[PDB]
């Protein structure tokens, strides 16, 4: 056996809340949309 004691701590005063890492629930990529873009403005010229 061994003698064990129990105390308490207050969060914020004693332990600072850390911030979560960069993460999210996985969502399928909804892509994007942009025509003004010059690269597409030249890709269409190549196609024509």
């Amino acid at each position: 056996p061994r003698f064990v004691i129990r105390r308490e701590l207050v969060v914020g005063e004693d332990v600072q809340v850390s911030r979560e890492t960069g993460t999210s629930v996985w969502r399928p990529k909804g892509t994007r949309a942009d025509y003004n873009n010059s690269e597409y403005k030249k890709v269409r010229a190549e196609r024509l």
Partner: protein, 268 residues
């Protein structure tokens, strides 16, 4: 052995609905390209039966042909026609199988084999180009000063007929000047239409080269085209019948791929 085909273009009838026929007829270059599209040799006809492929100009026969777009009145209506003369059989089935909105009636192919001798009066109606080359070309006339940028620019420009000379007689003598070489004679040539036709060619250029290949970052420029035009009819007297067949099979003009040149001859 000359195929004298005929088109019946479906023009508009309401300037509030799309009318692709008139828009197509507005540009001469698109008319020429569409007319040349009716000649698939052996590859475009058999590989694709529905013309659902990207356009390749090298896949079509380079068969010379003439065409005149005009108007006629038969019995009760006015029709826009495109009379096309060619030495190869025209494949109109392959031409408008997807763009049948352009045409009002199915096309026709009737053989034209004339055996014509000399000394017989015949009537005609042709549209000709009216450009001459000035051996003294005027300078560029930079519009800020209107004097000169360069000096000499040999250019096909215009047929000018003095100041007070009549245009029809001038065109008649201009045609009769080259008529002995071709082999006919004019007596009552008249002028009906005298104006301009317009077009625009792509003529691709290059601006920037790829990061891994040829200059495929290229784009399309646009080169405009203008043509002075005359339409004239009358009667011609046949001489030296060997040459007249060559003129009939070749055409009279300098813009034979842009309407002018086709000569249609009928017996008296």
């Amino acid at each position: 052995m000359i195929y004298l085909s005929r088109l019946l273009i479906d023009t508009g009838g309401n300037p509030d609905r799309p009318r692709p026929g008139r828009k197509w007829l507005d540009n001469i270059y698109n008319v020429h390209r569409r007319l040349s599209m009716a000649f698939p040799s052996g590859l475009r006809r058999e590989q694709d039966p529905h013309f659902l492929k990207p356009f390749s100009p090298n896949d079509f026969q380079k068969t010379p042909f003439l065409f005149r777009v005009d108007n006629n009145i038969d019995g009760n209506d006015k029709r826009a026609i495109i009379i096309v003369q060619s030495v190869l059989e025209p494949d109109w089935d392959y031409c408008f199988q997807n763009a049948l909105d352009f045409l009002a009636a199915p096309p026709e192919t009737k053989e034209y084999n004339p055996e014509f001798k000399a000394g017989q009066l015949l009537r005609f109606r042709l549209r000709v180009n009216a450009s001459v080359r000035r051996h003294i070309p005027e300078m560029v006339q930079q519009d800020g000063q209107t004097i000169e940028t360069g000096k000499i620019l040999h250019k096909r420009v215009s047929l000018t007929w003095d100041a007070s000379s009549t245009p029809d007689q001038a065109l008649a003598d201009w045609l009769a000047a080259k008529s002995p070489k071709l082999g006919f004679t004019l007596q009552r040539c008249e002028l009906l239409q005298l104006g301009w036709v317009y077009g625009s060619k792509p003529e691709p250029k290059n601006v920037k080269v790829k990061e891994q290949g040829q200059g495929y970052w290229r784009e399309h420029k646009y080169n405009p085209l203008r043509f002075r035009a005359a339409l004239l009819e009358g009667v011609l007297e046949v001489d030296d019948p060997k040459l007249f067949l060559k003129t009939l099979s070749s055409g009279i003009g300098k813009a034979k791929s842009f309407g002018f040149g086709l000569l249609s001859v009928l017996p008296i």
